[PDB]
């Protein structure tokens, strides 16, 4: 349950990401593939080399969904319904991978938004990524 402070915190941090969201999207993916190589099993059709346009484009996609989710922080289940569908009925990614992407996203933000990545903001972003993961995996069975 995102508290009002968390929602504020998230909106701020994400605010600063701005035009770089797609790049942070792509960088998080790249750190995920390297740190947690089992995650590559879901992208056998992608070129996972450094700076692939597949990874780049995929980063954008992801980053965009996060924006939409921040934008509708109060209505995630609803703002992300089509995405929960896709993940639950087509993709069927194992839930543990959501924690690995979430972590690589925190790491990316930390490295790029040093002044905004305070302990309380870190706390909020984590709770937020968790909430997003819950929603995306809520219609699995």
């Amino acid at each position: 349950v995102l508290s009002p402070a968390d929602k504020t915190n998230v909106k701020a941090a994400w605010g600063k990401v701005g035009a770089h969201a797609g790049e942070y999207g792509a960088e998080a993916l790249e750190r995920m593939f390297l740190s947690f190589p089992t995650t590559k099993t879901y992208f056998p059709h992608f070129d996972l080399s450094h700076g692939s346009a597949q990874v780049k484009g995929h980063g954008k996609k992801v980053a965009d969904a996060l924006t939409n989710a921040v934008a509708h922080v109060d209505d995630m289940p609803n703002a992300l319904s089509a995405l929960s569908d896709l993940h639950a009925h087509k993709l069927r990614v194992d839930p543990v991978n959501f924690k690995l992407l979430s972590h690589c996203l925190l790491v990316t933000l930390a490295a790029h938004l040093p002044a905004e990545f305070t302990p309380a903001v870190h706390a909020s972003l984590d709770k937020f990524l968790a909430s997003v993961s819950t929603v995306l995996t809520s219609k699995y069975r």
Partner: protein
């Protein structure tokens, strides 16, 4: 796997009683039913729409038997699971693209299947030895992922 001799005796004893064909089909079917997400790897298997369609699917049964067959061999080389499962580990990663978390799900399902089958004979301590084996096997299968 760090199994005390008496743990290894207990694992072996019970495994003597298992019908690998039977158990293999039950374990794989239950996986597909309890964690439908796992069905992503079997769309060529046909109808997996209801519990009955899964459990009685001749393709699921044949596969389950294959998987538990490979597993039983693993039980004779508890000493060297990594070597034993190395070509299978490569295949799952490189050809099949199976997230290794799937190996842990099957291990837990299998344990429920042995509890189902042996009732009271599947004692707390017998379960503890099998928990170790199953994790050992899941680990050996993921050792070659890259």
């Amino acid at each position: 796997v760090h199994l005390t001799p008496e743990e290894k005796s207990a694992v072996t004893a019970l495994w003597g009683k298992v019908n690998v064909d039977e158990v293999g089909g039950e374990a794989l079917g239950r996986l597909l039913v309890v964690y439908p997400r796992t069905q992503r790897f079997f769309e060529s298997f046909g109808d997996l729409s209801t519990p009955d369609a899964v459990m009685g699917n001749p393709k699921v049964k044949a596969h389950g038997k294959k998987v538990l067959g490979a597993f039983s061999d693993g039980l004779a080389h508890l000493d060297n699971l990594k070597g034993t499962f190395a070509t299978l580990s490569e295949l799952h990663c490189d050809k099949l693209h199976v997230d290794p978390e799937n190996f842990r799900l099957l291990g837990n399902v299998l344990v429920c299947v042995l509890a189902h089958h042996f009732g009271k004979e599947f004692t707390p301590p017998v379960q503890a030895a099998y928990q170790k084996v199953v994790a050992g096997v899941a680990n050996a299968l993921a050792h070659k992922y890259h």
